[PDB]
Design a protein around this ligand. Sequence first.
Ligand SMILES: C#CCSC[C@H]1O[C@@H](S[C@@H]2O[C@H](CO)[C@H](O)[C@H](O)[C@H]2O)[C@H](O)[C@@H](O)[C@@H]1O
Ligand SMILES: C#CCSC[C@H]1O[C@@H](S[C@@H]2O[C@H](CO)[C@H](O)[C@H](O)[C@H]2O)[C@H](O)[C@@H](O)[C@@H]1O
Ligand SMILES: C#CCSC[C@H]1O[C@@H](S[C@@H]2O[C@H](CO)[C@H](O)[C@H](O)[C@H]2O)[C@H](O)[C@@H](O)[C@@H]1O
Ligand SMILES: [Ca+2]
Ligand SMILES: [Ca+2]
Ligand SMILES: [Ca+2]
Ligand SMILES: [Ca+2]
Ligand SMILES: [Mn+2]
Ligand SMILES: [Mn+2]
Ligand SMILES: [Mn+2]
Ligand SMILES: [Mn+2]
Lengths: 232, 232, 232, 232
Amino acid sequence: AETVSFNFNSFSEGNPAINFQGDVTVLSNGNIQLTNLNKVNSVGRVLYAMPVRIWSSATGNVASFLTSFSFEMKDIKDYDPADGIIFFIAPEDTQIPAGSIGGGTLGVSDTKGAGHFVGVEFDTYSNSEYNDPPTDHVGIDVNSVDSVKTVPWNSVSGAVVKVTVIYDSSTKTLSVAVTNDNGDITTIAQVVDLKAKLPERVKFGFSASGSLGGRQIHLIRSWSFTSTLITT
Amino acid sequence: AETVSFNFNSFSEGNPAINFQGDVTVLSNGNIQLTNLNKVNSVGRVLYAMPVRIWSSATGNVASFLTSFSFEMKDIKDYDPADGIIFFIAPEDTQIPAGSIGGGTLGVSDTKGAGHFVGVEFDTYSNSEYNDPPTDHVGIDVNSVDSVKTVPWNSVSGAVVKVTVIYDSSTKTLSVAVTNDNGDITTIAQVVDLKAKLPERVKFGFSASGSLGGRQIHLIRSWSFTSTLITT
Amino acid sequence: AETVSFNFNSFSEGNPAINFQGDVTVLSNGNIQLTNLNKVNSVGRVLYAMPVRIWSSATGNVASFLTSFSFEMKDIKDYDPADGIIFFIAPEDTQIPAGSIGGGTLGVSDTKGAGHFVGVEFDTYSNSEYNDPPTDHVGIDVNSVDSVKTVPWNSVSGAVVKVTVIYDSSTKTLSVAVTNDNGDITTIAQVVDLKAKLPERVKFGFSASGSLGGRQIHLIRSWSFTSTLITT
Amino acid sequence: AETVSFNFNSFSEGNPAINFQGDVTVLSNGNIQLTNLNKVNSVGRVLYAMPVRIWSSATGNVASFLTSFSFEMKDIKDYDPADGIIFFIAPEDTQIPAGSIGGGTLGVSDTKGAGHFVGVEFDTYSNSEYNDPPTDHVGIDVNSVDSVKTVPWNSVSGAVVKVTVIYDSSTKTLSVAVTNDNGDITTIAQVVDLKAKLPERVKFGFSASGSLGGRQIHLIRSWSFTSTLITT
Ligand SMILES: C#CCSC[C@H]1O[C@@H](S[C@@H]2O[C@H](CO)[C@H](O)[C@H](O)[C@H]2O)[C@H](O)[C@@H](O)[C@@H]1O
Ligand SMILES: C#CCSC[C@H]1O[C@@H](S[C@@H]2O[C@H](CO)[C@H](O)[C@H](O)[C@H]2O)[C@H](O)[C@@H](O)[C@@H]1O
Ligand SMILES: C#CCSC[C@H]1O[C@@H](S[C@@H]2O[C@H](CO)[C@H](O)[C@H](O)[C@H]2O)[C@H](O)[C@@H](O)[C@@H]1O
Ligand SMILES: [Ca+2]
Ligand SMILES: [Ca+2]
Ligand SMILES: [Ca+2]
Ligand SMILES: [Ca+2]
Ligand SMILES: [Mn+2]
Ligand SMILES: [Mn+2]
Ligand SMILES: [Mn+2]
Ligand SMILES: [Mn+2]
């Protein structure tokens, strides 16, 4: 079996294991700050530098995976706390969409909300143009920020949030468990055929965005991942 | 919302938060040892003492949950390393089945392998009477030790194993991720309608069993859990 | 170490974490209403269903605890705003005293004011029979509603009150901080040996009561708790 | 009654409500970073700019206070994780001691460990020169970093820690409750006569330090305080 495994308790801007895109900075505490609070339509993304083979064209086998991460979203004076963080999977050549308007796109899609990615979004603003639910929500995205499925959620300013994601290759189920600061758990699961929607080699990471009036602190505190693909 | 949450880094005898059934002891290091190595048809079970409201007859709402645990199985001289550990969910009045033969029953079912429980087993012996797969396996059980689904696995003697379980109430999906000592991840997921198979109030826990010639060390090292039920 | 931790932002009828005693109801907003406004000598109590091992006869170690809660007391037309709320600790088998006269007993003691409990009272009526101070007060109680110590306080009708309680096992100090509506804080601290006054296993809760003439709305809005016992 | 109350969910560089001393900075996320990882014997402190009248020469009354804060300590590559954070109270004119050697002096004392302050230290290095206990600890300090009392503790790298402090003026008791990442609570309480050790008006704040080989990240995430002094 072919396995990719890593653990990040902290992040350093110098390290080759991570690719930094757009307005991403690394704070002295080791946290990744995805958006620039003084920039209009700010977009920042982070990717694990090594491409992970999630399926085989030779065997037809799809990898399984377990991944855990922690993030923080914090309000800033005068600006609307927007637009959120997206944990995404995309082709290895992925870049911030050209002429990105940030905001509702979450740095992974065009103005119409279309892209080439599979993701778990932690959306803190209601964009009617992408048919967003009325409140804060966790969503399962397939090539669009117009979510396949959403679950009502609450983004608490300055709160540390824990996420656990299981992708079972046999049932093609993407399961998400989100642990809020008040102790409650929020789940969302969706059948997503990764072979049909993504290439053999993909990159995994995080993305966040803001606008002119919609800005907030987007932080990635830690990340652990382990994926296994059967080669027999 | 109604939430039940706990975290056990260690265990202690006399902790009113845990119900001890059968042959369970607590070691000096804080580990729970489920089976008695000197007893025939040894059965040991640990339950979280407080019943959990996994669904409401008034609203029709079902609870989602997230749990993590770590266990160890270790071989003993002369005896066949058997029979394994099962993480289970059952009605609050649950007891070791009367006249339990232990062994392949994993302490949750009768001689025919029938019971009233939903569980995730970590099976180290192949019982033909319960149509077990030929090698060690992780299985999803619904009122039977004749698993609804199995996945090939390997129980390494003296190895610490990490498990992560997500239940999404909306899709009724029970998802499992098992982190092996060789670094690989093993997953298994199954749609299980907890509202159709179990009463409103349930107990969560662990069970292990042995036979005359099939005995091993069954250890529960740690356990965290969080469940949320949306209320009217 | 052995830790018990819970958080209630709201309450619900049928939640197995809460034992309801006497005249307690749960309002639609999630608040617990401890007394029946149309009943004479009304007594209502709520207990955390799981017994907490506050000390061990095996090691001699005593647990430390941190708890926070919010309550509301509101005057009702024609009746004397009485009698108050008590946050208490008692043996796991605790029940409303048989033939309870309510009123000044605060639902935890007999007519003479004697009982088996340790508590923090928020007294709104001066009972000369229990040597109450002349004004509203916060009191620390040890097997009696004739307080070991009191501090002058003011119960404002319809005001939300925040309480923070720290018990340090090493110094045996029970410390209380009460945050009034107008922003002011009221404190009271007392050395209380829980190992000498209470059994190893207890229950934690709230109690309120009234008389024929003395009646008011007694509400428990939220409650958080964490206790740690060193298992050397 | 005379009450001082404030709440900081975040911090900002252009805020006249806070005095910044030494090597302290404000990160873009709003966190206060007390020490400079690139500086030898680094010292940084933050104070609430308004002096708080903790006792009256006119009435002889002493204030009671309730404060809550959250911090983070994180290890840095190659350097020994040191020296820790101290929550302190000192005369309004307080400055970093002249020619501060950083290290075990926690930025509040001279080389011999003497100063003019009352504090709660979260010590992560054992200094034999100040008779430190062998492991990480929480300590109650009175004009010395050679603690009046200590309690064993564990500083977990990258973990968010919550603290609750109650000072009861009548019993002169300073009570501390520390909530660790793993859920456990650590307490320490000590009788400290603030009227005898500190002047009428005082300043409250935080301090941290480092040395040549002993450095780590020291962060103050949030701070809430309320003091009430009876003026009758
Ligand atoms: C050759 C060959 C195969 S040996 C099979 C032996 O099975 C046991 S019971 C059996 O024990 C197993 C441990 O090995 C497991 O614990 C099973 O769950 C339990 O059902 C009988 O008692 C013996 O008579 C017999 O030899
Ligand atoms: C004169 C004079 C003073 S009025 C005192 C009255 O006390 C009540 S009981 C009393 O009621 C109080 C409410 O006011 C409180 O609830 C007390 O806890 C409870 O013990 C008697 O029944 C009456 O007969 C009597 O007049
Ligand atoms: C021998 C031996 C054991 S190593 C001790 C080293 O201590 C430092 S100072 C010391 O540094 C510590 C960090 O490790 C802490 O910051 C202390 O508060 C600070 O006082 C000296 O400069 C070195 O010469 C010496 O090697
Ligand atoms: Ca949106
Ligand atoms: Ca079997
Ligand atoms: Ca009274
Ligand atoms: Ca030190
Ligand atoms: Mn959305
Ligand atoms: Mn099986
Ligand atoms: Mn009283
Ligand atoms: Mn010290």
